[model samples]
Target: AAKYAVVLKTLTDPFWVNMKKGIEDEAKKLGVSVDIFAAASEGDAEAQKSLFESLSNKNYKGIAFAPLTKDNLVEPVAAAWKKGTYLVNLDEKIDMKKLKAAGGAVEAFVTTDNVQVGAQGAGYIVQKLGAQGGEVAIIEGEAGNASGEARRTGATDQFAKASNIKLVASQPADWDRTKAKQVATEILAKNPNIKAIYCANDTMALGVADAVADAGKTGKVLVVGTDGIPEAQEAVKAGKMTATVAQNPAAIGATGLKLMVDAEKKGKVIPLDKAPQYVLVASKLVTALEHHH
Candidate 1:
């Protein structure tokens, strides 16, 4: 019997909770043993690193992890790879260039095309605004985080392509609800005519929604967020948020685990020089209309 482990960013977020459920459900269905671990919080890079390091020293046949950041787990993952543990990178990508420099290689990678996620959210905002497009703003996630940065790039590029849409302010909130709210409040104060706000994640989207309401412009200003967490979905249904780009985290987890298990069964990790299998889970634009089911 082969054993495996999965390390995720945090269970505090419903997105990761769903991912955990998917991994656990898949393990049960496959009749394989899987130990799951997570960091205390999304910002606790050290905790995630220690968790990965401990698991790396274990006898598990394979390990899958969604890193907190690109560089936090590089050393540990590289060490684990050196020890011949089949590695699958999940969700938030680890910097492959850094990992390769560290002599670490992953067997597979599974995640949503975050850039597309951002683009979809921004596109939805533009579509909703139509030819009457007005000022918009973006609340970015933590600076330097690849997933967040990609989302920002996608939204920025999409907004650039729309001639009528003017991006008023783009600021980082470090993925914190309070910080996002604060940033939104300031943006609203300076740009009273801002018609929409795009958040890199649903958590920040909720905060932006709150800010819009606080400014007495709830219905007037559209709020679009990435990551269709349950709360965000409910917000959309209730008209608190205009839309969200929902990534299939469950599919990501299940697919990552399945790939790792398949690699284990084949009895060999993909060579370091060979490109790892990459799977891009699709994201969807979830609006109030879609919640009818």
Candidate 2:
């Protein structure tokens, strides 16, 4: 029997909650079993490290992990791989070149390109704001986190090509709605003329909406978020939020688990090319039109 583990950044986020469900459902459908673990919060990198170490000591054949930090778990992941435990990376990206240099390797990476995820949100904002172009702000996720950074890059890169859009304020809210609200408040206070906000994640987008509503710019200020969580989708339906990029979080878990099962059965993790497999799940732009579903 091949038992595995899927560790995530946190269980507290709604996105991960959905992801957990997807993982469990897929595993059951595939007739495989897996133990899932999560850090207390996104900020608790140490807890994640401890969990990885603990899992390494267990009898699990493989691990699908969404690391909280890029480099902190290099040694642990490498050690686990060296011990013959199959490794598949989840949402957050680990620098493969760096990890391989450190003697660790990932069999595959299953996630949204994330750069394109951010770009999708930016693309929507660009159309919504029109050719006139206006001041915009950004609400980012945790600082130094690979997922957040990649998302921020995706949007910023897109904005750079849009000469009409001017980005005035950009900062990390640490992926918390309250912190995001505070940052949004400050940005709005300083840049009252801001026209749109692009949040790295749906949770922060909800917070940005709060600040925009407080400033009486709800409709006037277009707000777009990533991760099409149900709440954010409802907000879009109600016209509170402009749009959100929908990432298949559950698919990340389910599909990753399926790959884990297949690879383990084959008794090899690497492919013919001897390169790590990278699976990028498709993302969608959800708006008021898709709200009913």
Task: Please report the candidate that would top TM-score against the real structure.
Answer: 1
RMSD of each: 1.8, 2.3
Q: Give the TM-score of candidate 2.
A: 0.94
Q: Write model 2 residue lDDT over 1-293, tens digit each, in one string.
A: 24899888889899999889999999889888899999998788898988889889989988999988887677788888888888898988876767787777878889998899888888888888889989988898887777888888888988887899999988999888999899999998899889989998999999999988898888999899988999999999898999999899999989889888888987865532357888999999998874553
Q: Encode model 1's per-residue lDDT on 93-147: one tens digit a residue.
A: 8989999999989998899999998899899988989998899888998887888
Off by over 4 Å in 2: 271-273, 290-293
Score candidate 1 by TM-score against the native: 0.96
